[PDB]
């Protein structure tokens, strides 16, 4: 049959993202709006810095700013933890270590508020170098394809993942961002604990030519594989 959580993602779902961030004492907020079509693993989102100029590079916030919109192929529907936790949602926590630089720690709640899928995030960044690639804005407005390997955490009744993001550096070379992730359901209801698999993601970053605020337009495709 069609899972309860799965039925909530059959059409185009509107998305709201809210982030409050603090990086080396530099406080900022981001609001995002768009839509998710999980049948096609498709996300279209636009993000606005509501406090003015973003004090970090936009590409460093992409993983933080809704894996419930991944396309799980038919043979893999049983492994979709993210949709199975809905509508009550899940807590998504990360540490992101920027090699030779500081770290982000993030706590988010991903859940339905009526028809809207909400990602509400707190971000804390510490130990960044003022002349580093992040606070120095040396990352290209760019993003690579990747595979995120997802594994069950039965003890916490959720999942974990660790992956590397590579951010192109303007001179040359790559800035590594080491992600450690844990997701736990918010509700007491049953959820799907998946077999080992991975999410294949491609991301295109762009600008709205009519937008004067510091912003990022994100087009993303996410597909489950590996079984």
Curated annotation (Swiss-Prot):
Changing residue 200 to F: In H9; increases fluorescence at 395 nm excitation. Photocytes. Changing residue 201 to H/W/F: Results in significantly red-shifted excitation and emission maxima. GO terms for biological process: bioluminescence; generation of precursor metabolites and energy. Changing residue 103 to T: In EBFP1.2; shifts the excitation and emission spectra to shorter wavelengths and increases quantum yields compared to BFP. Coiled coil: none annotated. Changing residue 169 to V: In EBFP1.2; shifts the excitation and emission spectra to shorter wavelengths and increases quantum yields compared to BFP. Changing residue 97 to S: In alphaGFP/cycle 3 GFP; improves folding at 37 degrees Celsius, reduces aggregation at high concentrations, and increases the diffusibility of the protein inside cells. Changing residue 66 to L: In EYFP; leads to yellow fluorescence, folds faster and more efficiently at 37 degrees Celsius and has superior solubility and brightness. Changing residue 143 to C: In mut1.9; shifts fluorescence lifetime from 3.03 to 2.74 ns. SUPFAM superfamilies: GFP-like. Pfam families: GFP (PF01353). Changing residue 222 to R: In Azurite; shifts the excitation and emission spectra to shorter wavelengths and increases quantum yields compared to BFP. Keywords: Chromophore, Luminescence, Photoprotein. Green fluorescent protein has been engineered to produce a vast number of variously colored mutants, fusion proteins, and biosensors. Further generation of mutants led to more stable proteins (at 37 degrees Celsius for example) with brighter fluorescence and longer fluorescence lifetimes. Changing residue 220 to G: Suppresses the 399 nm excitation peak, leaving only the longer wavelength peak at 475 nm. Contains a chromophore consisting of modified amino acid residues. Maturation of the chromophore requires nothing other than molecular oxygen. Changing residue 196 to I: In mut2.1; shifts fluorescence lifetime from 3.03 to 2.50 ns. Changing residue 148 to I: In Azurite; shifts the excitation and emission spectra to shorter wavelengths and increases quantum yields compared to BFP. Belongs to the GFP family. Monomer. Energy-transfer acceptor. Its role is to transduce the blue chemiluminescence of the protein aequorin into green fluorescent light by energy transfer. Fluoresces in vivo upon receiving energy from the Ca(2+)-activated photoprotein aequorin. This is Green fluorescent protein. The gene is GFP.
């Amino acid at each position: 049959m069609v899972s309860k959580g799965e039925e909530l993602f059959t059409g185009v779902v509107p998305i709201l993202v809210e982030l409050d961030g603090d990086v080396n004492g530099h406080k900022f907020s981001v609001s995002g709006e768009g839509e998710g079509d999980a049948t096609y693993g498709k996300l279209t989102l636009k993000f606005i810095c509501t406090t003015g100029k973003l004090p970090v590079p936009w590409p460093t916030l992409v993983t933080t700013l809704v894996q419930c919109f991944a396309r799980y192929p038919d043979h893999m529907k049983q492994h979709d933890f993210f949709k199975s936790a809905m509508p009550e949602g899940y807590v998504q926590e990360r540490t992101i270590f920027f090699k030779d630089d500081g770290n982000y720690k993030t706590r988010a709640e991903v859940k339905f508020e009526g028809d809207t899928l909400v990602n509400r995030i707190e971000l804390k960044g510490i130990d960044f170098k003022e002349d580093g690639n992040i606070l120095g804005h040396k990352l290209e407005y760019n993003y690579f394809s990747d595979n995120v390997y997802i594994t069950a955490d039965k003890q916490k009744n959720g999942i974990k993942a660790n992956f590397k993001i590579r951010h192109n550096i303007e001179d040359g070379g790559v800035q590594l961002a080491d992600h450690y992730q844990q997701n736990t359901p918010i509700g007491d209801g049953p959820v799907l604990l998946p077999d080992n698999h991975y999410l294949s993601t491609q991301s295109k970053l762009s600008k709205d030519p009519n937008e004067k605020r510091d912003h990022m337009v994100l087009l993303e495709f996410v597909t489950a594989a590996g079984i």
